[PDB]
Amino acid sequence: EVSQDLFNQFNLFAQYSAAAYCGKNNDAPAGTNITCTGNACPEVEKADATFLYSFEDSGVGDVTGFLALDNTNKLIVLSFRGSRSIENWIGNLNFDLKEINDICSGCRGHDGFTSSWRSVADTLRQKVEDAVREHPDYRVVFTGHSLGGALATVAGADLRGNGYDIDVFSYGAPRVGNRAFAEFLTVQTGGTLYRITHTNDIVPRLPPREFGYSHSSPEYWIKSGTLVPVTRNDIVKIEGIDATGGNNQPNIPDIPAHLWYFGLIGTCL
Amino acid sequence: EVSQDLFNQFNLFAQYSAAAYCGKNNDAPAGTNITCTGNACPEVEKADATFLYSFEDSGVGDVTGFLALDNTNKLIVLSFRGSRSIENWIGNLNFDLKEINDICSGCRGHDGFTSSWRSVADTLRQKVEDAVREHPDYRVVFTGHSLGGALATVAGADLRGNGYDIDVFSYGAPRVGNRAFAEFLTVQTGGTLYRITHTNDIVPRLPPREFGYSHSSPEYWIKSGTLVPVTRNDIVKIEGIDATGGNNQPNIPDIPAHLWYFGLIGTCL
Numbered sequence A, B: 001e002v003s004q005d006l007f008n009q010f011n012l013f014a015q016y017s018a019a020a021y022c023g024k025n026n027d028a029p030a031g032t033n034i035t036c037t038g039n040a041c042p043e044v045e046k047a048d049a050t051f052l053y054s055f056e057d058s059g060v061g062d063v064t065g066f067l068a069l070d071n072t073n074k075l076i077v078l079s080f081r082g083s084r085s086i087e088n089w090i091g092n093l094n095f096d097l098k099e100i101n102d103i104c105s106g107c108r109g110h111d112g113f114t115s116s117w118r119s120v121a122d123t124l125r126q127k128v129e130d131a132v133r134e135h136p137d138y139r140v141v142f143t144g145h146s147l148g149g150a151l152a153t154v155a156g157a158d159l160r161g162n163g164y165d166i167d168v169f170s171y172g173a174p175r176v177g178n179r180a181f182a183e184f185l186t187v188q189t190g191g192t193l194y195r196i197t198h199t200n201d202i203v204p205r206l207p208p209r210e211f212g213y214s215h216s217s218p219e220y221w222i223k224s225g226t227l228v229p230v231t232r233n234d235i236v237k238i239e240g241i242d243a244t245g246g247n248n249q250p251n252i253p254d255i256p257a258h259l260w261y262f263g264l265i266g267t268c269l
């Protein structure tokens, strides 16, 4: 249902996303090999990849993640890490929008994600800029799981059209803002967004449509169960703003589903 | 390296042992279906399987677990929970031995595992007897992960030779006593102990040999990595008390490895 290649790409960014949680970063000097505990990120481990800059609890958002250089794959990787405790993060998730004309006109994004990104937008733009300067040939990728996937998405929309493509690969991300904004993300050039989801994962169903939120298209939806390995025939491309039939179906959502994207993610053995 | 039938049984009781941590409520009334959060136990869900008795913080050692009827697979299963926090359990772990001539001539066993079991033995022996009566054709199986594996193993050594075979399936169990006990467990009749280990899991390496502890023979050792699905080709039987070159190797040991036996175990998504 997707190609081998694009699968491998989904697999690799799910691990950079998992490494945001299970990596040895911070108290990590720049230039360090990236490794994870608990077999969280073996594809990232097999590559020649190293931190370019680590951040922890940065800004009003208390944002955490890392910029990586991968010379094996010729990436620059911005990987945001979701919440340290997802269930609490879901419980306290506030649904307020706020205006974001900076990125698109008439676009409203989750005030909270957009606020948190804003607060670190300058620093991280610079670092990504440095890294694009040093390696002009490298693909720039932003990625993340859960609240991480949200950040990568907001950051990515914010920083496109500035000379380099930015590809975004998000895993179980929540909705990030209103319909205008969903439309922006569906068509905005200068990068592709790959919005990945799994079975009845709860996180992509928040905030709810009823509070003003809409989902960009397309959606890449993993059919295979929680703790079950994913094959190419287990991922289905679902076209259409707010399409139903992928993750957005009328059943009871699930938190374990959220923690299984190709492998264990958002928690560390 | 092991038969398919045998690989099916390991997988199954690895799920019953995981159910001891993830199966929904220990206030579950007698006779209710067995289910788990997070896809921890789908081979158990798929069977007609029900609780016979549920215990929690029972006796002086706070033992937790259940007895179960599996009308599909024709089993009575006593499954013991390991520790709710393994990492502390490891570090708080005392190495004192105690005489156990009650079960075994010249046998010394771990003091807490041994007292814990003694202290709930009479109750649970009852409960199992009642079941053998009712389903005389059913295989009795005791099982357990981590501390729970050690409990199943002590219970198994202690309640054999009373008419009905006890098979025992232990997953990441530490050492349970001295050389003598090790030999008893290797040759005792009235059932088979199946002592499963995974890669470089630390729990089967504790207490140390240098503390007077020995492991029964054989061992079944899963060589596939953490988070890797297991096939019957990934398990190796190692013969000989204290054999090395299965889990008992001099390399650096690991905790994530202890939480992956056929699938997630010892922790609940």
Ligand SMILES: O=C(O)CCCCCCCCCCCCCCCO
Pocket: A061, A062, A063, A064, A065, A080, A081, A082, A083, A084, A085, A086, A088, A089, A090, A092, A093, A094, A095, A111, A112, A113, A147, A148, A151
């Ligand atoms: O609506 C909002 O603004 C967000 C509400 C949810 C708050 C719940 C707290 C969750 C606790 C976990 C803290 C880890 C966050 C790390 C962020 C890394 O980018």
Ligand SMILES: O=C(O)CCCCCCCCCCCCCCCO
Pocket: B061, B062, B063, B064, B080, B081, B082, B083, B084, B085, B088, B089, B090, B092, B093, B094, B095, B111, B112, B113, B147, B148, B151
């Ligand atoms: O040497 C000993 O006596 C054992 C030492 C380890 C003590 C750590 C306490 C365990 C805390 C978590 C509670 C789970 C125990 C439940 C046992 C179920 O069979």
